[PDB]
Amino acid sequence: FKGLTVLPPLLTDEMIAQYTSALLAGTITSGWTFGAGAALQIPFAMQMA
Amino acid sequence: NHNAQALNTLVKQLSSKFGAISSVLNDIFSRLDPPEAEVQIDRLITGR
Amino acid sequence: LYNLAPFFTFKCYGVSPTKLNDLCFTNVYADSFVIRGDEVRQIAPGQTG
Amino acid sequence: SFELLHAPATVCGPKKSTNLVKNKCVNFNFNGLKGTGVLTESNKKFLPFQQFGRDIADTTDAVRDPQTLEILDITPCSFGGVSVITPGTNTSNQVAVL
Ligand SMILES: *[C@@H]1O[C@H](CO)[C@@H](O)[C@H](O)[C@H]1NC(C)=O
Ligand SMILES: *[C@@H]1O[C@H](CO)[C@@H](O)[C@H](O)[C@H]1NC(C)=O
Structure with missing residues (x-):
């Protein structure tokens, strides 16, 4: 080279995908409750109501 | 694309002479006296 | 050539006399002609006369 | 009057000749072309x-x-950055290097 290199990111794409999967599972299963304290389950129909 | 173009132009700009006789340090040192090659090296260093 | 003692003008343009031993020349013209003593002034580049 | 560019060149001063070294980081001088690099086998259709x-x-890859009239690729031998991992002076003097 000419002294110009690229450094790898700390978080791999698999880790980011895991974070996204966790967010999707939490929001599908517990609504907005998981973002304000303990995650409380609720059926999806009642959540959308 | 912006990152790639910035790095590519940084690589490409080395070929310019910046007013010196040549853009290669080895030639300047090989075919000039040190008192006369000093100014050429200074010009290239400042440009880079 | 350095064995010749009476050298009067030895100026070089773009090259150093001491660095000639380590250089190679793709083509060199031994353009030679005999001149008057003071005419060495006009043998210079970008100079009229 | 002369032209100072690189090869081809038919006029040269006195010098010595040395053999060929392959995959070794070697200081070289080819016909007045000073530099440092490693020469490797070339698959380019020169x-x-x-x-x-x-x-x-725009890099002087080969000469x-x-x-021997062989295509000699010129690349600089390996270089890179060095990083130092430390747990802290108060804790220990052990050091890991990256
Ligand atoms: C001498 O140099 C010429 C120039 O290319 C080359 O063709 C020839 O093979 C060389 N001879 C030897 C014995 O290396
Ligand atoms: C300095 O040493 C003390 C004693 O072990 C430790 O508790 C402290 O964390 C050290 N300082 C820092 C900035 O870690």
Whole structure:
């Protein structure tokens, strides 16, 4: 080279995908409750109501 | 694309002479006296 | 050539006399002609006369 | 009057000749071309009239041998950055290096 290199990111794409999967599972299963304290389950129909 | 173009132009700009006789340090040192090659090296260093 | 003692003008343009031993020349013209003593002034580049 | 560019060149001063070294980081002087680099086998389809090649990224990748007429790729031998991992002076003096 000419002294110009690229450094790898700390978080791999698999880790980011895991974070996204966790967010999707939490929001599908517990609504907005998981973002304000303990995650409380609720059926999806009642959540959308 | 912006990152790639910035790095590519940084690589490409080395070929310019910046007013010196040549853009290669080895030639300047090989075919000039040190008192006369000093100014050429200074010009290239400042440009880079 | 350095064995010749009476050298009067030895100026070089773009090259150093001491660095000639380590250089190679793709083509060199031994353009030679005999001149008057003071005419060495006009043998210079970008100079009229 | 003379032209000062690189090869081809038919006029040279007195000098010595040394053999070929392959995959060793070696200081070299080819026909007045000073530098440092490692020479490796070239798979590039260099044409017979190609003297020295600035193929990619405007870099003097190759120079043709004045005796064996082989395509000698010129690359600088390996270099890189060094990082130091430490747990802290108050804790220990052990050090890991990256
Ligand atoms: C001498 O140099 C010429 C120039 O290319 C080359 O063709 C020839 O093979 C060389 N001879 C030897 C014995 O290396
Ligand atoms: C300095 O040493 C003390 C004693 O072990 C430790 O508790 C402290 O964390 C150290 N300082 C820092 C900035 O870690």
